[model samples]
Target: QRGLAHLVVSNFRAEHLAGDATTATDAYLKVFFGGQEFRTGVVWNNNNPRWTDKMDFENVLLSTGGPLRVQVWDADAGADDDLLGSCDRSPHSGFHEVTCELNHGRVKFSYHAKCLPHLTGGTCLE
Candidate 1:
């Protein structure tokens, strides 16, 4: 049997970018699950940003119990992007609140997962 989950990422706030609040940073998110990665839209010139993006993953083999990884980055226009911080969680069937600490400030977000039974034909029966 396989597993299924839906991640709803929302409410990300930070007080600084990379240790100091000298300038505003363009912050974004990179979410990873089951060997796949998804990125959130960049929030420009804001230390506090919120993104309510939902992601769905089907046919999930929950053997390794790989945690859902969320990484935050500061977008740069002409230079390389900077890594702010990251958080990970092993998802379950329900709602979860995850938080992480950056070099400067902290971040908070929530996600929900719905685990279902998998059919014999590689399809999830929700």
Candidate 2:
């Protein structure tokens, strides 16, 4: 009963991460939770020392229960600032809209990204 809909640039942030889990059979960055799977992929980093000079990314998550944490493997060797992969708890926490960035072996989420100003919010290039 936990799955994500298709992704769109505007509503859904382009470059992001999520706190869900997925089987290895799915895409590289797919997430999974509650025995269900959600597909994810590497998005374009439109604002990293390129295009408008704004650093941004996004991460999606279908929470389970309690505070959820994202886990990634071998984040060293420049893989740190990229979406690795993740898994969730149980009971499900609905779909969360979190703002995040890939940096130093961690995906940092931001509240500002969740509440962008004007149409330039949520890591989407517009």
Candidate 3:
């Protein structure tokens, strides 16, 4: 599939979740991609306002060469009723271009973050 390059499960603390640890987590997921890490899937919640969920959540990093798409919904519903969003740009080399739709009092991701390799290798696309 063109979505979901890796999925991981771990226990982390509030203070260290989004710091350097985020890069570490990105590396961990890249393990499935043969050591090629571009973007990170972070758990969005009250702690991280840059995501789309209410309670603690999981982030899925999608490895690809195009734009990134995401969705947010009730965990119970899973993919049944997904909210859509897109990341048209990123900062880091192979970093996340877009994030999921962010709504208050809810979980804020589509379960994945995709990276397009075209923008970071040489030419910049804004």
Candidate 4:
């Protein structure tokens, strides 16, 4: 059997960034991993946005799964969502304090991750 992991993501926040010409940045977080997706609520008109949201992934396969991809975006009323920045981290076997540098600012992450050992046939490395 392949290795399974438990990933807990929480306490996410985005730094101050240069926003649109009219208003502050209505920012939110988008997380993707192991064929699953999670998102946080949008903080309207706030360049420095913080989230109290938490995401738990309990069925992530270590051998077949990729890194956890996190992105910060600004929500718009009529136009498409604007991209601020993004970062990704591989699921190692311990705690990871992750952060990403955006175009205008930065994003920070606090999370814990643990992965069980897989069967003898090794799979991925990068």
Give the top-scoring candidate (lDDT). Answer: 4
- List the candidates ranked by TM-score, beginning with the highest: 4, 1, 2, 3
- Tens digits of per-residue lDDT, candidate 4, 28-112, equal 8899888889999989998888999989887577556888889898888787888787888766656778778887999998766
- Which regions of candidate 3 fall more than 4 Å away from where they truly are? 1-64, 77-79, 82-101, 105-120, 123-126
Worst 10 residues of 4 by lDDT: 117-126
| Per-residue C-alpha lDDT of model 2 across residues 1-126, encoded as one tens digit per residue | 222222212122223233223312111233333333433343332221111111222333323223233333321233334344443433222234453334422232212223222323222222
**Which one wins by lDDT: 1 or 4?**
4
TM-scores for all predictions: 0.75, 0.25, 0.24, 0.85
Candidate 4: which pairs clash? Answer: none
Instruction: Give per-residue CA lDDT, model 3, range 10-122, as digits (tens).
Output: 22122212212223111011112223333334443323333222221222333343432232222211233222222232222332222322342222222222224333222
Model 2 lDDT, full chain set: 0.29
Candidate 3: count the clashes: 11
29 Cα displacement, candidate 1 (Å): 0.4
Model with the higher TM-score, candidate 3 or 4: 4
Error of 1 at 76 (Å): 0.9
* Regions more than 4 Å wrong, model 2: 1-11, 16-29, 40-96, 104-126
The regions of model 1 sitting more than 4 angstroms off are: 2-15, 18-22, 63-65, 117-126
Give the alpha carbon lDDT tens digit for every residue of 25-65 in model 1. Answer: 78888988778788889888887777776665554644354
